[model samples]
Target: SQHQNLIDRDRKVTFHASTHLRDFAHGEAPGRVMAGGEGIHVVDKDGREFIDGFAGLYCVNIGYGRTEVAEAIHRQALELAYYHTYVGHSNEPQIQLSEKILELAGPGMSKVYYGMSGSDANETQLKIVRYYNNVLGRPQKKKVIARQRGYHGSGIASGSLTGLKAFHDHFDLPIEGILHTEAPYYYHRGAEREGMSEREFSAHCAAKLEEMILAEGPETVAAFIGEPVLGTGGIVPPPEGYWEAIQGVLAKYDVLLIADEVVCGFGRIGADFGSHHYAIKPDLITIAKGLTSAYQPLSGVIIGDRVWQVLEQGTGEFGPIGHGWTYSGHALGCAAGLANLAIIEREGLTANAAETGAYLQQCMQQTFGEHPLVGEVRGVGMLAALEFSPAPARRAFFDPALKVGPRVSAAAMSENLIARAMPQGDILGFAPPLVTTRAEVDEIVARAKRAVDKVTDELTRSGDL
Candidate 1:
């Protein structure tokens, strides 16, 4: 009992991600501290196992507690554990891992730059984009265009590039020149136009992007960055033909497209990268999270042949690319990544993601289709979201004061399921691990139903429904 109380106290003292722990004073605290993980389930301090529905922030495509991956790290640590990738120095794991990543990456990716997290990876991409324009004798072409409600990363430069207000609030993020276009969220934004097909909505998004580029002067804009299926901004997948139309506009303006695959990479979207799934021909791709399943911090920037050439040629003129972190190509991270990729390939996790993710999406639709509060249920691959609104037909979101998203998330956590209450709006996001099976999907949906019901009941009781 003393140990249990101690654990609870420790949890109380800790501030959790995307939550205010103080508010849970009278509510439930985490009853169990995760001790170890295996397969699709995690064992808590009390030894009670719970299915991992969110894949530890939509990473962990290779599942968990694999001895081979751990051994990779241990072995690398014993031999040439740490080394900087700066200047001409490099390590074996870094070089081999980069080569493997390129092999697995979609065509046209020619170079890889490593980082420790999605935020830093995106910051690197921004620097690269700006550097490319500068070297090409176009210093004025430094602006990047992102979409409203798009989630990029949380660094000074990357946060500025992110389109969500929450990431921008208080930080004064998105410094000038980082423009935002309309997101390809058909569920909410498409309501204004009656009988607009997904294809038509996608066209509108592309047209809006073009309009923004023109308004800002295409020469002043260097790149457009976005996730294939929006992650933290509420798992909003692109409408039909969205990428084709958007790519057409970018091509016309000579603007580079940067695919932010931090959350969508590593089979989360049933492909190595969402770019492949969506057929987006990007000039640069940002990746993280599942690179090592978050077992070790790792992220990467994959450059296209066009951009790689520019970077290489620029180095000739600029002496050296005066950018990079000390942990740019960490050996341990690389080893973990290599082993993680091996598992993904060996287990066919990508195909599993496709099959099970589809089933999960269908199950969510079937379960919540008639729910009064469910405005829209949209997903792609293993990523999904259930948007809540007071008026479902009108797609009217509840007032911010209701704190609907947080309430739903709290309920979900109480049910021993981890679901993200995305900050951009009122949406409950789910991104289970690729190793998840049909039975796990059913459990996720079942737990989600309980969470939704509990929150809905509270809202109704308070006359806020």
Candidate 2:
């Protein structure tokens, strides 16, 4: 009984998924244990507080301690805990949530297919795409093109759509029929492509897509998938005019578009949807994360008119769509989603995200733009990042072997801030909660500046500069 509340601190728990073994071995303090949270800050077991600058894997858009979400989940679970949306069965929360999603998704978005994760929603997307094409009698148009840095999901088919190699490593991912083109990451340009301006680079990216499509035979390609702003890749906002060029190419080739708005949806990008923010008219919109603000696990694929017509036609022939999950539309999660959206609407968090996010990005640029280690400070709406390079003007990055990004992230954590070291580059990614205020922005930025100074000094003293 003595150890009831005071649990064993030295427990060797090694089964954590997606956790870095190096940090675990090194005993990163924040990674040690998180006890609870409030507002934008989380408290560790030992009572250390940290500002969640990355918004908990870029989800948790509404922030922590949302009883509205909690209460809704409670009410729904009490009323109906287990029910399947498979076949003819249905529930109130599922039906209502679907209507609410379509309403918020705007005109082209017609239906919502429920899932439990961003990965599954995207998996559903591929299945729906295949089914749609099969019904349209174009079996050849089944190959999908995704961006080099695009992140869709982690399943074999979904992970294949994901362009990052790390997700593919050891898994033999990027399964057949999936191809990746150049990411619109202008910062990646070097002496080889120095002649092109951002506008020219944007066109070059589109040209590459066209070339890939033409090379592969446009008839064989099914659709192109992309995040409105490159989310898990490197938090990159596309070069100006990138979407138009790419969209035009897609139109010419008769290929469809799938906007993976898992991270960019629901006020995270200071808009109802990233598709709206970027004017991307996708045939399918994969959504999760902010759909229920991570209070409950839920996800969906918003079927646009372009895909819905084919889907309706196919269902008429097949009688019933074969794709469904036992918990396809879990009522508890749907209730949380309904309440979550209510909080978003009632509190005007999207506008707050715009006001505060712009301020945060502006401060980031002002503070980091001229720093010796910072190459560029880029952002859109509530998303921001600091891409570190040895020479900002020359776009020269530090040696990847040096692992500079993780060090900077560690330093930030020491200052009580959670800055994510992005997977692709030495980039510090930030996506604070939508409810974050200007004051919170100042605090987060201040810690970031402090972290940069400490890390820079250490690197200099060590003669790694």
Candidate 3:
């Protein structure tokens, strides 16, 4: 009774993300009121437990119910909770956390700028790109190229950077200078390219990128942004030489590269950062999500020496470049970040992600690779996806009307598991917490198999197969 009351109240007042307003308000769309979480599971108001296979939007890297993060936040709140990181004023935890981030990020990275989410950090990145070009006296060099199906953020400038059409539908986005090229998705290659290998397809993608740069006038293009591993876009990893080939094009046109590591950072993908895992030497790096395991809201932009030197010169030319969020460098958030990083390091979670994460991929492939309903079982490290197709041999997609992806996701929920039906394709994405054990991985895969089987039967009976 109390749970229903809370849901009613929330429905009347809260504006949920990407939800159908009418259905939610009328209670047609169910809302599970969660009460608490522990490790890789969460409990609802009715006390039903669920395996969090997607790790809370792929952010809770260290898992749930870690007292370490809570205690750190408590200590910082009691000592010094808030401060402004404006005009040279700084805090202790912020300083230490910045150093730690730069160290983990490796060389070429010079400075860190903080924000509250991936969207704002990416927003900051766009401004920096513009400012970088302005200082260099190249006003026309302000356009940025992103790939189709890339997920950046949802705010205005950041949303514009995102290449998904749904993100742009009614929002009037991809505003002017933001251009998009082909995604490095080998599975979705054109029929003519079916004979090509992954490496050949990767080279084709790079050639398309070079074509865009040349057609747009290379001098007018400023930067190219992408997630190291495409998240929210079917959990697709790049094909063999995708990154190396794309980098060659960018280098030829003098276009900067922004690595959006929002979902791939902090050991989530079995690496310190996806950039390191893929050897993507970005000019600027966006970090969020696992920075504090979602214990607190914090994100940052890591500027490389190439851009840092120009920013320093720009600021000297014009006093303190105009950008500062009130909670840009929140002390409590930084403290949580420090504690979270310590836990990730002390427990050797990155190495664990590599070892155990390999097990996850192995199990997923063995279980689903031959399933008739599954067209692809692809991922690296801890990230994985099962792409559903009507005709697996020909790579034919199901009609969007069937809603196969959401049905499979609902079926997973019925089995007390959480997996994301990625926004774009008929794909179910999984990114279990980095701390997940081998035993836990087995349970998740077994549960997922049941869900997929159930969906497959339903679709086959309905003549939608």
Return the top candidate by TM-score: 3
RMSD of each: 2.5, 2.3, 0.8
Candidate 3: residue pairs that collide: none
Give lDDT tens digits, candidate 1, residues 248-282.
99999999999998888888988888988888888
- Error (Å) of candidate 2 at residue 67 is 1.4
Compared with the true structure, what per-residue lDDT tens digits does model 2 show for residues 42-150? Answer: 8877778899998898888999888778888999888997688887788998899999999988998888989899999998989988898899999899989998989
What's the best-to-worst order under lDDT? 3, 2, 1
Task: Give the per-residue Cα lDDT of candidate 1 at 37.
Answer: 85
Candidate 1 regions exceeding 4 Å error are 1-33
What lDDT, from 0 to 1, does candidate 1 have? Answer: 0.86
Worst 10 residues of 3 by lDDT: 25-34
Work out candidate 3's RMSD over C-alphas.
Answer: 0.8
**Residue 152 error, candidate 2, Å:** 0.9
